[PDB]
């Protein structure tokens, strides 16, 4: 969630919600250049090949506009699509 509601209690739901507000408050203000909910793997490969799993439309990135056509290959940086790998819409290496 930083980068299924039946099983939790209402007190656990509000615990999870307020913890989500805390962890989205942590990366604001100070510690803002990094992301605290980011990837814990080191970026030992600056560019990766990325394969699209599911069709997710046209998305934007920092300085360019990406497509999410299903079953397509990108040769892009790990940090540009690292969050999208975490969502699972992109999955390769």
């Amino acid at each position: 969630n930083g980068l299924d509601t039946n099983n939790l209690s209402h007190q656990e739901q509000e615990y999870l919600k307020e913890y989500c507000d805390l962890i989205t408050d942590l990366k604001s203000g100070d510690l803002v250049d990094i992301d605290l909910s980011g990837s814990l793997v080191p970026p030992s490969d600056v560019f990766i090949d990325v394969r699209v799993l599911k069709d997710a439309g046209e998305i934007q990135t920092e300085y360019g506009v990406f497509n999410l056509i299903k079953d397509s290959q990108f040769f892009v940086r790990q940090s540009d699509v690292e969050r999208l790998i975490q969502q699972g819409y992109l999955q390769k290496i």
Partner: protein, 192 residues
């Protein structure tokens, strides 16, 4: 917040990062040198003077992630160290077979650097890769036999090794630390 498999130890890719952050001798295949008649490099975690003074077909010293990044470009070829030769590895094998109680005087990053240069520099070795990897595997196996022999001396007080590699520290860290922690817990409960 931290995952359970990264709680009390380093993952091997963090060890890869740590040994990617060292200097290494290298041969540039591009000329970035300003003549008497191009944005500068300008890095903040390493000395950029050796990278600003990058001369083709010379020996320079750059950090290893730059080395691998430029080897991917093939704009610059990584030079193996002195201990990555057949003769020096045979000398290390002879030292391992000579003194059974003591580990050889190998660098701390001898398994991780060897793996990095085997998977990234397949045409940068003066000696053949074949017997180099064979001697690497032989040294790894005899060091495994020596740490298996030394693990019989799991003491409650302390335990010492001389020249164990960082990757072998992550090999043996959770087992040794947990077993000695429980031995110390047993003896401290045994105290009056």
């Amino acid at each position: 917040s931290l995952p359970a498999h990264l709680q009390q130890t380093f993952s091997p890719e963090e060890i890869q990062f740590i040994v990617e952050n060292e200097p290494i001798k290298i041969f540039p295949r591009i000329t970035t040198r300003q003549k008497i008649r191009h944005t500068r490099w300008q890095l903040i975690t390493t000395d950029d003077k050796a990278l600003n003074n990058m001369v083709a077909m010379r020996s320079t010293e750059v950090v290893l992630w730059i080395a691998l990044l430029l080897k991917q470009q093939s704009k610059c070829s990584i030079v193996a160290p002195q201990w990555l030769t057949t003769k020096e590895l045979d000398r290390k094998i002879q030292y391992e077979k000579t003194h059974p109680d003591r580990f050889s005087e190998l660098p701390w990053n001898w398994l991780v650097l060897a793996r990095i240069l085997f998977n990234k520099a397949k045409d940068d070795f003066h000696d053949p890769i074949h017997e180099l990897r064979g001697k690497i595997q032989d040294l790894r196996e005899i060091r495994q036999i020596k740490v298996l022999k030394g693990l019989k001396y799991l003491n409650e007080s302390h335990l010492q090794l001389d020249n164990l590699s960082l990757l072998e520290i992550n090999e043996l860290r959770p087992f040794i630390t947990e077993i000695m922690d429980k031995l110390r817990e047993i003896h401290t409960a045994s105290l009056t």
